[PDB]
Design a protein around this ligand. Structure first.
Ligand SMILES: [Cl-]
Ligand SMILES: [Cl-]
Ligand SMILES: [Cl-]
Ligand SMILES: [Cl-]
Length: 206
C-alpha cells in the first residue's frame, strides 16, 4: 500500500496552465484554492489524473488544496487488428487491486512487479463480437513490461474511457463490460483471468 493516498479525479487549468479546478469522482467540482505541487498543464485543458488533495469548508462553500498530482493511463479500447497492436498482443502479468465503473470510465488500480528503466505500456484489446447480440463489450488488458524484471511492487492506475459505447439515437441501452487480464496463479504460471467477466460490469451510458 502506497505512502500517499491517491484518488481518481479530473483537473482543469486556466489561461496560464495552473490548476484551477478539481472534480472528484464522488462529488461536485471544486475551485482549487491552493496547488502545493505548482503543476502546470496545457492552458484551458482538462486531465484525468491521480491526486492527493483535501477539501476545506467554511461551512457553506469548500475549496480544494492539492498536495500531489500524477498521471494515469487512459487507454482507448481498440480491436486486436488496430495499428497499435501491429507488433503483437502483450500480456505481462498484473494483479487487480480494485476495479469499478465511475464518471464515464472503467477505473482500476493494478499491482505490478517492476524494476526500472523500462516503460510499462498498457492498452485495452476490444472485442465487439457480442455487442449487437447482447450489448457485451469484451476487454482484454494489454501490458508490455518491455523485459522489466519483476522485483518491486508498484501500483498502476488506468481509467478506460467508455464514451464510444454511448448511442444518442439509442438511449437507455444497457452495456455489459467483461474485463479479462493475465495474472499469475498459485504456482507462478501466467493465466488469463475471467474473474471480472461473471456477471461483468453493467451500466447505462446516460
Ligand atoms: Cl487525460
Ligand atoms: Cl475555511
Ligand atoms: Cl477486488
Ligand atoms: Cl500509472
Amino acid at each position: 500500500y502506497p505512502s500517499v493516498k491517491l484518488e481518481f479525479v479530473t483537473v482543469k487549468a486556466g489561461t496560464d496552465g495552473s490548476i484551477q479546478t478539481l472534480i472528484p469522482d464522488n462529488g461536485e467540482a471544486l475551485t482549487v484554492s491552493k496547488d502545493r505541487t505548482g503543476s502546470a498543464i496545457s492552458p484551458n485543458t482538462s486531465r484525468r489524473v491521480m491526486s492527493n488533495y483535501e477539501t476545506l469548508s467554511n461551512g457553506h462553500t469548500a475549496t480544494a488544496v492539492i498536495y500531489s498530482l500524477q498521471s494515469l493511463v487512459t487507454p482507448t479500447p481498440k480491436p486486436a487488428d488496430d495499428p497499435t497492436y501491429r507488433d503483437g498482443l502483450k500480456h505481462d502479468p498484473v494483479d487487480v487491486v480494485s476495479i469499478w465503473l465511475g464518471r464515464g470510465y472503467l477505473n482500476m488500480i493494478l499491482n505490478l512487479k517492476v524494476n526500472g528503466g523500462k516503460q510499462h505500456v498498457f492498452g485495452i484489446v476490444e472485442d465487439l463480437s457480442e455487442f449487437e447480440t447482447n450489448g457485451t463489450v469484451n476487454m482484454l488488458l494489454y501490458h508490455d513490461a518491455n523485459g522489466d524484471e519483476e522485483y518491486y511492487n508498484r501500483r498502476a492506475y488506468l481509467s478506460v474511457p467508455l464514451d464510444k459505447y454511448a448511442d444518442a439515437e439509442n438511449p437507455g441501452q444497457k452495456i455489459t463490460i467483461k474485463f479479462k487480464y493475465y495474472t499469475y496463479d498459485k504456482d507462478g504460471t501466467a493465466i488469463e483471468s475471467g474473474k471480472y467477466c461473471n456477471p461483468g460490469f453493467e451500466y447505462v451510458p446516460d
